Amino acid sequence: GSSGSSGMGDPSKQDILTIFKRLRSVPTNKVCFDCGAKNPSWASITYGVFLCIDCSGSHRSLGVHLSFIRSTELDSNWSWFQLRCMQVGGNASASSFFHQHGCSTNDTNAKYNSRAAQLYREKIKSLASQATRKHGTDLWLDSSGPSSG
Numbered sequence: 162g163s164s165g166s167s168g169m170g171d172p173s174k175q176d177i178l179t180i181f182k183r184l185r186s187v188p189t190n191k192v193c194f195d196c197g198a199k200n201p202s203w204a205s206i207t208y209g210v211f212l213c214i215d216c217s218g219s220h221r222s223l224g225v226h227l228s229f230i231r232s233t234e235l236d237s238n239w240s241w242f243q244l245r246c247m248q249v250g251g252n253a254s255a256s257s258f259f260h261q262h263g264c265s266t267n268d269t270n271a272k273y274n275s276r277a278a279q280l281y282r283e284k285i286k287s288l289a290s291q292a293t294r295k296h297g298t299d300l301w302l303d304s305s306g307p308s309s310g
């Protein structure tokens with residue numbers, strides 16, 4: 162129940178592109194984890210997966226609370242914590258994670274509304290910290306250049 166202070170600057174386009182350039186590279190990430198559409202702009206931070214304008218729509222219906230959707234080419238006002246969620250997840254990660262439990266469900270309003278799915282989301286939040294906390298904003302990867310102030 163901690164509101165959370167605000168003493169840091171949001172990630173710029175470049176930085177955001179750097180976090181997506183690494184995830185996109187992957188063949189299982191550059192394809193809508195749902196159908197497999199290549200260059201899946203749409204991305205779901207909740208499950209840190211890649212979706213396509215087609216599928217992404219379904220998620221939006223569920224409710225930003227159930228599955229938040231954010232583009233990569235347009236949406237630039239991303240949150241450090243979020244961005245990571247994508248790196249600390251991946252498509253395959255879920256493709257298996259789910260089965261491991263035994264979802265045996267395809268439906269979007271069900272497969273995602275199932276326990277197996279939930280477990281994932283939470284997990285993403287945790288890991289996201291490992292990367293986020295790391296040198297706070299300073300892109301763990303390397304020193305991009307801290308702006309005076």
Ligand SMILES: [Zn+2]
Binds near residue numbers: 195196217
């Ligand atoms: Zn799709």
